[PDB]
Amino acid sequence: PNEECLQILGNGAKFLSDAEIIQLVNAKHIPAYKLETLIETHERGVSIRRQLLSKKLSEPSSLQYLPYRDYNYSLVMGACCENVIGYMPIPVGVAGPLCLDEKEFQVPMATTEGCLVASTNRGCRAIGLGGGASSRVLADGMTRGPVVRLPRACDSAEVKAWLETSEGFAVIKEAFDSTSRFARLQKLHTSIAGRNLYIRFQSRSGDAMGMNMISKGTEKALSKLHEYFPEMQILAVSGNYCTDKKPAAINWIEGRGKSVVCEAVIPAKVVREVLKTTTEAMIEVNINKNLVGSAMAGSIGGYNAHAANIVTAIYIACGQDAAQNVGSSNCITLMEASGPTNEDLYISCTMPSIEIGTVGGGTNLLPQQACLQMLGVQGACKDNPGENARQLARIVCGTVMAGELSLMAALAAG
Amino acid sequence: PRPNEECLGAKFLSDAEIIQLVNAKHIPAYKLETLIETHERGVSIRRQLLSKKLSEPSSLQYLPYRDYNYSLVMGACCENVIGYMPIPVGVAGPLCLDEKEFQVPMATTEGCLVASTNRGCRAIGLGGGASSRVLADGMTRGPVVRLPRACDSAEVKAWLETSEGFAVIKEAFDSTSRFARLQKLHTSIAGRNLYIRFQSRSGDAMGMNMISKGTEKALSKLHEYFPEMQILAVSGNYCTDKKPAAINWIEGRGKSVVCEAVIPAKVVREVLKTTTEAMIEVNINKNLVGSAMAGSIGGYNAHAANIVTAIYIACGQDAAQNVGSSNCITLMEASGPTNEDLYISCTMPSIEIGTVGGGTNLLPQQACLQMLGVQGACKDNPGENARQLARIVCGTVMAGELSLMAALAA
Amino acid sequence: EPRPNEECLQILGNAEKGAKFLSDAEIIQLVNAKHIPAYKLETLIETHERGVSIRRQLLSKKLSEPSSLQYLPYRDYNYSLVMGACCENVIGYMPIPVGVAGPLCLDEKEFQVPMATTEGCLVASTNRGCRAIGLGGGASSRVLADGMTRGPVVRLPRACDSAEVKAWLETSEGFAVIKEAFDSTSRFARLQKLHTSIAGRNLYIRFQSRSGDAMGMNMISKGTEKALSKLHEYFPEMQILAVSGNYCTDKKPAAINWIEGRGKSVVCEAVIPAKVVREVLKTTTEAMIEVNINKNLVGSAMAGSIGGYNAHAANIVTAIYIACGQDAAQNVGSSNCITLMEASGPTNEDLYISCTMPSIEIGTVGGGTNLLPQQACLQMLGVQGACKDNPGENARQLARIVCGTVMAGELSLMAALAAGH
Amino acid sequence: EPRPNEECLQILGNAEKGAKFLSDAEIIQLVNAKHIPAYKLETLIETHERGVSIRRQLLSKKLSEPSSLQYLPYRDYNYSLVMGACCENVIGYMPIPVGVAGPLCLDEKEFQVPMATTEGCLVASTNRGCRAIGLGGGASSRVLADGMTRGPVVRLPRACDSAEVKAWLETSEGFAVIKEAFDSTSRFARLQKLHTSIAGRNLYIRFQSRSGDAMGMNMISKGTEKALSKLHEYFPEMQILAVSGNYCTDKKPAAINWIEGRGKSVVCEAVIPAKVVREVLKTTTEAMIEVNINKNLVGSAMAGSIGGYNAHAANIVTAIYIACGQDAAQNVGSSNCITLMEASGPTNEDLYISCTMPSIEIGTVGGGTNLLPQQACLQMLGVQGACKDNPGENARQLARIVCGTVMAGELSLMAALAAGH
Ligand SMILES: CC(C)c1c(S(=O)(=O)N2CCOCC2)c(-c2ccccc2)c(-c2ccc(F)cc2)n1CC[C@@H](O)C[C@@H](O)CC(=O)O
Numbered sequence A: 001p002n003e004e005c006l007q008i009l010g011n012g013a014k015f016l017s018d019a020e021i022i023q024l025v026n027a028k029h030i031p032a033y034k035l036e037t038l039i040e041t042h043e044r045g046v047s048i049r050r051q052l053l054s055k056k057l058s059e060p061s062s063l064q065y066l067p068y069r070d071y072n073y074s075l076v077m078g079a080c081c082e083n084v085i086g087y088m089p090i091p092v093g094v095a096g097p098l099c100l101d102e103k104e105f106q107v108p109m110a111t112t113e114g115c116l117v118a119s120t121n122r123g124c125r126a127i128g129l130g131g132g133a134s135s136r137v138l139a140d141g142m143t144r145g146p147v148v149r150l151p152r153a154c155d156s157a158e159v160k161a162w163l164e165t166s167e168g169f170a171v172i173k174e175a176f177d178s179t180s181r182f183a184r185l186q187k188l189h190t191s192i193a194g195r196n197l198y199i200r201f202q203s204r205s206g207d208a209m210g211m212n213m214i215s216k217g218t219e220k221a222l223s224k225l226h227e228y229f230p231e232m233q234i235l236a237v238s239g240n241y242c243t244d245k246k247p248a249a250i251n252w253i254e255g256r257g258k259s260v261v262c263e264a265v266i267p268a269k270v271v272r273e274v275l276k277t278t279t280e281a282m283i284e285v286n287i288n289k290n291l292v293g294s295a296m297a298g299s300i301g302g303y304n305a306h307a308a309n310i311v312t313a314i315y316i317a318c319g320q321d322a323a324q325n326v327g328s329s330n331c332i333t334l335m336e337a338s339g340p341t342n343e344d345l346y347i348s349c350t351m352p353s354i355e356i357g358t359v360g361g362g363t364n365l366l367p368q369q370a371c372l373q374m375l376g377v378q379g380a381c382k383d384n385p386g387e388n389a390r391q392l393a394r395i396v397c398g399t400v401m402a403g404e405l406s407l408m409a410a411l412a413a414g
Numbered sequence B: 001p002r003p004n005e006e007c008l009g010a011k012f013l014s015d016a017e018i019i020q021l022v023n024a025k026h027i028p029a030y031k032l033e034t035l036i037e038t039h040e041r042g043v044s045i046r047r048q049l050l051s052k053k054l055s056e057p058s059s060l061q062y063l064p065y066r067d068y069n070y071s072l073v074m075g076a077c078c079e080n081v082i083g084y085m086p087i088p089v090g091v092a093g094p095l096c097l098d099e100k101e102f103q104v105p106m107a108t109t110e111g112c113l114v115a116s117t118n119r120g121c122r123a124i125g126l127g128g129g130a131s132s133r134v135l136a137d138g139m140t141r142g143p144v145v146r147l148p149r150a151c152d153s154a155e156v157k158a159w160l161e162t163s164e165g166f167a168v169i170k171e172a173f174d175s176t177s178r179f180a181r182l183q184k185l186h187t188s189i190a191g192r193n194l195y196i197r198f199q200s201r202s203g204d205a206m207g208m209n210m211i212s213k214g215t216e217k218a219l220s221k222l223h224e225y226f227p228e229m230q231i232l233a234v235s236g237n238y239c240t241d242k243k244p245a246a247i248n249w250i251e252g253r254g255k256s257v258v259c260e261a262v263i264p265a266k267v268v269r270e271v272l273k274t275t276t277e278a279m280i281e282v283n284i285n286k287n288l289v290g291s292a293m294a295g296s297i298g299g300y301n302a303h304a305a306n307i308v309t310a311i312y313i314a315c316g317q318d319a320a321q322n323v324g325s326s327n328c329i330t331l332m333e334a335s336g337p338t339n340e341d342l343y344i345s346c347t348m349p350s351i352e353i354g355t356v357g358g359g360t361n362l363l364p365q366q367a368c369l370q371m372l373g374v375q376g377a378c379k380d381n382p383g384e385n386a387r388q389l390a391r392i393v394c395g396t397v398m399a400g401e402l403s404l405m406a407a408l409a410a
Numbered sequence C, D: 001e002p003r004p005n006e007e008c009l010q011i012l013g014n015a016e017k018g019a020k021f022l023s024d025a026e027i028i029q030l031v032n033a034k035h036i037p038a039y040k041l042e043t044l045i046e047t048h049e050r051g052v053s054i055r056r057q058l059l060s061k062k063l064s065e066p067s068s069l070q071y072l073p074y075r076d077y078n079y080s081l082v083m084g085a086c087c088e089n090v091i092g093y094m095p096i097p098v099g100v101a102g103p104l105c106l107d108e109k110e111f112q113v114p115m116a117t118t119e120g121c122l123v124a125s126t127n128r129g130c131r132a133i134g135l136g137g138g139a140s141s142r143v144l145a146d147g148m149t150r151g152p153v154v155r156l157p158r159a160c161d162s163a164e165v166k167a168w169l170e171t172s173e174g175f176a177v178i179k180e181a182f183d184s185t186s187r188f189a190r191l192q193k194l195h196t197s198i199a200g201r202n203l204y205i206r207f208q209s210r211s212g213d214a215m216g217m218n219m220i221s222k223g224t225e226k227a228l229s230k231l232h233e234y235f236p237e238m239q240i241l242a243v244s245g246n247y248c249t250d251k252k253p254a255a256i257n258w259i260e261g262r263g264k265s266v267v268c269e270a271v272i273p274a275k276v277v278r279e280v281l282k283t284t285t286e287a288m289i290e291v292n293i294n295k296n297l298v299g300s301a302m303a304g305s306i307g308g309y310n311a312h313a314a315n316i317v318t319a320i321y322i323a324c325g326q327d328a329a330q331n332v333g334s335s336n337c338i339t340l341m342e343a344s345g346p347t348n349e350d351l352y353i354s355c356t357m358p359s360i361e362i363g364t365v366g367g368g369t370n371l372l373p374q375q376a377c378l379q380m381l382g383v384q385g386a387c388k389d390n391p392g393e394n395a396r397q398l399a400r401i402v403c404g405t406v407m408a409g410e411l412s413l414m415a416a417l418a419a420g421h
C-alpha cells in the first residue's frame, strides 16, 4: 500500500522495499532527487536508480549485463560521477618490460582494440635489446586561459602592458599563489582580440593534473586584476586559450602539462629480427607518413602513427581524464640512421602537451591506483612534489615510442 | 605441492605448481597461454607471475579480474590480459532528440560531468526537443604509394580521376565485402608520392578493418595497371586516423552530423541561470574568437570531447578516436519574436562510430548500446543503428555545450 | 589673372570648352571652396595625366612635407588602361626593379623568368638554382588540377533545412539545375563537383570551375550569383548572407586550399647529379636532405604551419606575380608549397628534388595583365593573353613556370643553408 | 665597325680605356663567345643603364618573340640605388599604379595612405572606409609588441643533450651570456625572452629583438650567429644545421607568428555611428555583425584557417607594402588579422570594429625603402627613414597606419557584402 509506506520513512529507509520506494516515485509522493541521501547503503541507491531507469527504456532487460554489485561507490559518489547505474569493465593488458631511464616498467593498457597491446609489447622488446630508452621532462605547467573584456582595445592594451611589467605580474602572482600550496605562477602569456584579452595562467600543480587548482588560482587572480581595472568584465573563466580538450596550436607550441622527449637506438640486427624490416625502410615510412603525410592532411601536432592509441589505453588504466587525449597525443616521431655503419635506427618522440597526474580525479579510485602502483607512481611523491606525475608522463612518452616503433615496422614490412 | 617432473593436463595442476614450473625454468612462461584451459585462470597466473617482478608485489590487489567474460576479449580485443578496469557509468536524460527520448550512458571519472550534461538535456526538453540530420557517412583509409617520378604519380592521379579508371578500382574495393561501396576518391600528390583517400560506407561497423581490406585489394588492382608503383604504407596518415587533421574537418570522416534546438528565454533563466544575450557573447568570444587565438583547427566548442569520450567508453567504441570525433563547432544565435530565445546548434563532421565489432561485441558495452536501441546491426536498413548513435552523440554534445556554456556565462 | 569662381564655372559648363580652357590653378581654386569635389576630377579633365597632375598638387598641400611626392614618377605612363579598371585616385606609379633568372629548363623548353623585387640577391640565388637544373638535364612539371573557387555563405531557417539543401545539391538532378545556371553566365563556366559544409543553419558552398586563361574571380563570382538565384527559386526562405563567406578561400591562409586546391595545382621535379651539387651549389646531397627534413618538414611542423613546408616559395611567387601583372595579395595562398628532397642515383649522391604547389592563383588575361609593361613579361615566357587553340594553356604554362622557378629558388637557398653561411 | 675578339679584350682590361671605348655589338660578341660572363656586365660597364640595355639585347634574341620587351620601360630610371643592393640581372622596371586613400583619421592625426595596386575598386573601397572612420570620430591604435625573430635549428648527439641546452638557455645566467653575445653585434640588438622547442635531438631557438626602424632580418641573423657561437663554447658537440629552421617563421604561414607575434603586433579600433553606417556604407550595424560572425569567424573556421579571420587584410597590406618599399613576399604573415564587430553606444545601434594584426613585418630603412619613389610614399606618411631621437618610432607608426588602413578596408568590403549586388 501507499500511505503506510510514507510513515515508515519518518520514523529509516532501510525498512522499506525496492518496489515500495519506487511505489513512492512512479506515484509522486516523494520527489526524485532526494533518494540520494535517504538511503544509507551506496549499492542500494544504485540498484534503485537502475530500476527507475529501467521503466523508461523500451528494452529494460538491457541493464542485466551492465555490472554494478561489489564495487566501491564510496570514492565515486560526490567526486567522480553522478546518476550512477554501475560500471564499465575495460580489458587491461600489459606491455613490458619497458626499459626507460635505467629502470624497467610493466605498463598497463586499458583497450578493446585487438593486437594493440601485443604490438606495443614487441616495441618494448626492441627497445630493451637496444639498451633501453632515455627521456626528459622539458617543461611542466597546467594552464587555464580565460577571456576578459574591457571597454576598448586601448584599455586592454594597457592592461596587457601592465601584466608584462615586473610589478604587475608580481601582484597577480601573489593572488594566484595564495589559493593553494602548489599554486606557483610562471610567466603569463596574453593575446588581444580587439577589446578582448586572453590570459594564459601556467603553474605546476604537484602530482595532480591540476585543473581544480589552476582554476581557483585563476579566479582569485582575475579578482585582483578587477580591483586594478574595475571596468573589466570577466567573460569566461575559460576562453578556450588554455586550451583544454580541444585541438590547438598553442598547446603544441607553448606546451601544456608535461612537455616530454624520448629516444632510443635500435641495433640493425634487432630491427631485422624482432621488427622484421630494415632501418632504411623505417625512415622511408616515417618521413613519408608521419611528416609528409600528416602535412598533406593539414595536421597540427599529429606527426605520429598512433600515439593516441597508447595515451588513451594508459589514461583509462591509470585514472586519467581520457578526454584530454585530444591534446595529450600531440606527438612528432623522428627517425634517422645511426651508429658506425649507419645501419642502426635512432628513434625519438616529442610530446609537448601531456596532461597527467597521480592524485585527484580517477586516481582516487582503488582499481586505477592498482595500475599506478604497478608503475610505482601512485599518489603524491612525498619528498619531491610532482615527480610521480613527471615519471608517469615519461612512461607514456616511452610507451608511445614503443608503439610507434612497432606499428611503423609492421607498416614498412607489409 | 608435488615435484616438478610429476606434473609434466593443466587443470589437474595447482597454481603454485605452474609457478614453480616457470621459476625452475622447466617450462617457458609464454607456453602457458596455450596449455592452460580456462581463460580466467590464465589471467590469474599471469597476474601472479607479474606481481613478483614489481617493486610492490601487492600492487594488483585491487585491480579486479574475476567473473568477467574473457572469451570475447582473448584473440579479439586485448592481449597479455591481467584483469579489467571499472569505469563508473552515469546516465544523462531524457535527451529529447528527433521525437524520441534517449537515456544516455556516460563512462567517466570527472565529477559533475554527467550532472552538467543532464541539466542540458532538461533545458532542451523544455525547449521542445532537438533535431538532427546525418549529412554524410564514409569511413576512410589513406595509404601512400610511390612512383619512380612525380610525372608517373601524376599519371596515376589522372587515371583514378577518369570514370573508367575509378570504375575498376571501385569493383576491386567493393568485391571484398557486402557493405564496401566506394564513394569519390580524394588524392594529393607530394612529389612522386601519392596519398589516396578511400572513402566508403561500412554498414553499422566503424569500418577500420573493412575499409583496409578493400584498400589492399584496390591497390593490388592499381598495381596491375602500374607495375612500378610501390605501396609504401597502407596508411600514409591521409585518412586521417587518430591524429588532428584539417582533412577530417573539411571532408568529414565517418558520420557528419548536425544538431539544433531553441531554448525559450524563460528556460534559459530558470534552468540555465543566465540569458540568451550572455550565452551568445560567451560563445562568440570563447568558441570562435578564443579558439581562433589559440590556433584551433576544428575545436570551436567548449568540451565536446568530454561527452564523446564518456559515451565512447560506455558504448564500446575506440576511445582513441575522440581526437577526431570530438571535432565540433557550436553556434549560438538570438531567435524568436523579440530575440530572447536561444537558437543553438552543433556540427560534428567526423564522428567515428559503430555498433558492431570491437568493444561493441562485449556484453556490458552491448547493454549501453541496447539502452539507446542501437546495439548490433540493422538488417532492414544497414548502417541505421550506427547513424542513430552518431545523432545521439551530437545531441548529447549539444546538451553538454548548452549546460557548460550557461555556467560560464553566469 | 585666375578669374573668379563664377566665371570659371561658366567655362566649365560651356560644352565646347570645359576644363581644357582652365588653368591648373583655376581648377584647384574651384576645388578649394567646393564646386568640384575631387572624385569628379577624373571625369572632368581633358586627359588622364592632367587629372593625376592636379590630384598630386591638391594632395601636396595636405602633407606636412609638401615636396614628399617629388620622386614619385607619374608622367609618360599609359593611364588609359588603368583608369576605371586597375586603380583609383591615382597619383603616379611605383617602379619595381625587374631582374631575370634563367634559362629555366622546364619540359624540354627554356624560359627566361622575370622577377620584380627589391630583395638583394634573390634573383641571383634563383638564377643559380636555374643553372643547377640546366646542367642536371632539366626539370619536368605537371598541372594536376585547375579550378578557381568562390565560397558564398547562405542561411536557411533551420539546420534541418540547410541539410535538405545540402542533400538536394548532392543529387545529380539538383546539381544539374545549378550547373546549368552557373554555366550560362560565361563561356568558360563549367561547374565541377560541388563542395558544401554546414555550420548549423549556415551552408557554405564552394563553387569551383575553370576560367580559360583568366584567374577567374569575377567570372566565378558572377556564375555564383546566378547559381544562387536558381537555388532560391527551389528554396524561397534561403538568405544569401555573403557572396564570399571565406570558404573559397581567397587571400587568407586556409587548409581547404591546401587540401582541395584552388586555381592550378602543380608539381615540379628534377634530378641534380652529384657533380652539379658540388660545383654549382657548393654542397652535398646528404647535407641538402638533412636541412630539408629538419627545416622544411620538422621545423615547419614545430612552427604549426599549414601549407608552409618550404624555404621561401613566397619570394619567387611574389616576384613573378608583380612582374607578370598578377594580384600580389594572392601570394598568401599561391605560395603554398612542400619541398621534398631524397638521395638517388649512383652513390646516393644525386639529389632528387620536387615542389608541389596545390593552389597557384594565376591568369594571363584580366586585371594587371591588361597593362603593356606586365604584358611584356608575359610575352617573355610566351604566355601573354588567351590561347585560342587550347583555352587555359597560357595560364597553365605560367603556373608550371612559377612552380619550376620556386624549385630553383628552393635548390639555391637550401644549398646556402647546408654550407653554414 | 665590328672588331675582332683579341682587340676587344685588351681595351676592356686597359684601365684608362675600358668598356666605354667598345660598342654594343662588341660586348655582346664577347658574352656569346664566352670571354666574359653575363652577370659581370654589372661591374664592367660605365653606365648602369647601358648594362641594362645590353642585358635586354642579349635576352631578346633568346626569346621566341624578339620584340617582347618593347613596352617594358627601363630608360631614365635611377639604377644606382638598385645595383648591388635590391636586384640583379636588371632588364628594366615594372610600374605599379599608385593611389591615395584618405584622410585616414588615426590617433588624432590624418594620413594620406599610398597603395600600389592593379586591382580595380580596391583604392575606392578603402577610401570609403576611411570616410566612414573619419565621420565616426576617427580611429585609435596601440602597438602591443615589437620584435623581429630568427629561428635556427641546431643539433646535439642526443635528445637528452638538447634538453640540457634548453634548460641552460632557460636559466637567468645562461640567457645573460647569450644576450651579451647577441647584443655585441649592433647597438639596436636588445634580445628579448628566448622561445625554444625540441624535436628529438633537434633544437629550434627563436631569437627575438627590436631592430630600430629596420625590419631587421640581417641585424637579427648576425646577432644570432654570434649568440650561437657563444652557445657552442658551452656546448661544443652542438652543430648548427641551418641559420633558419623555419621556426622564425619567415614568409610561410605559421601558428607561432599568430600566437607569439613577429615584428609589430598592433591593434586598431573605431566606433562608427549608426547614421554613417547607413549613409556612407549602405547597410546597418546589425547586418554587418551577422556577416562578420558568419564569414570572418565561422567561415574562416570551416575553411581551416589559422590567422585568416578577416575579409581582405592582404589586399591593403600588399598595396601599401609595394608602395612603401617593403618586402611584399612578407604579406604571408603580415596579413594575419582577426576582424571583430559589435553593437555599441546608448541604443546598441552603433558599430564597434577592431582589427588585430599580431605579425606586421615592416621597416622604414633598408631594402626597397632606400629607393626614392618608395621613399616618396614614406614621406607622405611622415615615416621615411630612421627616427633620430626615438629609434623604432617610424616603423611603429607605419605598422599602426597599416592596421588602421586594413580596418578601413574591412569596414568597406564587409558593408558591400552585407548589402548585396
Ligand atoms: C597496432 C594495431 C593493432 C595495428 C596493427 S599491428 O599491430 O601492427 N598488426 C600487425 C599485423 O597483425 C594485426 C596487428 C596494424 C597493421 C596491420 C597489418 C599491417 C601493418 C599494420 C594496424 C593497421 C594500421 C593501418 C591500417 F591501414 C590497417 C591496420 N593496426 C591498427 C592501428 C590503428 O589503431 C591506428 C592506425 O590506423 C593509425 C595510422 O597508422 O594511420
Ligand SMILES: CC(C)c1c(S(=O)(=O)N2CCOCC2)c(-c2ccccc2)c(-c2ccc(F)cc2)n1CC[C@@H](O)C[C@@H](O)CC(=O)O
Binding pocket: A144, A215, A237, A238, A239, A240, A242, A243, A244, A245, B110, B111, B112, B113, B116, B117, B302, B303, B306, B403, B404, B407, B408
Ligand atoms: C561540466 C564540468 C563538470 C564543469 C563545470 S560545471 O559542471 O558546469 N560546474 C557548474 C557548477 O559548479 C561545479 C561544476 C565547470 C564550471 C565550474 C564553475 C563555473 C562554471 C563552470 C567546469 C569548469 C570549466 C572551466 C573552468 F575554467 C573551470 C571549471 N567544468 C569542467 C569542464 C572541463 O572538463 C572542460 C573545460 O576545461 C573546457 C573549457 O571550457 O575550456
Ligand SMILES: CC(C)c1c(S(=O)(=O)N2CCOCC2)c(-c2ccccc2)c(-c2ccc(F)cc2)n1CC[C@@H](O)C[C@@H](O)CC(=O)O
Binding pocket: C119, C120, C121, C122, C125, C311, C312, C315, C412, C413, C416, C417, C420, C421, D150, D221, D243, D244, D245, D246, D248, D249, D250, D251
Ligand atoms: C635568397 C636570399 C637573397 C637569401 C640568401 S642567399 O641568396 O642564399 N645569400 C647567399 C650569401 O650571400 C647573401 C645572400 C640567404 C643566405 C645568406 C647566408 C647564408 C645562407 C643563406 C638568405 C638568408 C636566409 C635565412 C637566414 F636566416 C638568413 C639569410 N636569404 C634570404 C631569404 C629570405 O628572404 C627567406 C628566408 O628567410 C626563408 C627562410 O629560410 O626562413
Ligand SMILES: CC(C)c1c(S(=O)(=O)N2CCOCC2)c(-c2ccccc2)c(-c2ccc(F)cc2)n1CC[C@@H](O)C[C@@H](O)CC(=O)O
Binding pocket: C150, C221, C243, C244, C245, C246, C248, C249, C250, C251, D119, D120, D121, D122, D125, D311, D312, D315, D412, D413, D416, D417, D420, D421
Ligand atoms: C574591394 C574590391 C574591389 C571588391 C569589392 S567592392 O570594392 O566592395 N566593390 C564595390 C561595388 O563595386 C564592385 C567593387 C567587392 C564586392 C563586389 C560586390 C559586392 C560586394 C563586394 C569584391 C568582391 C568580394 C567578394 C566577391 F565574391 C566578389 C567580389 N571585391 C574584391 C575583393 C577581393 O579582392 C577579396 C575577396 O575575394 C576576399 C573575400 O571576401 O573572400
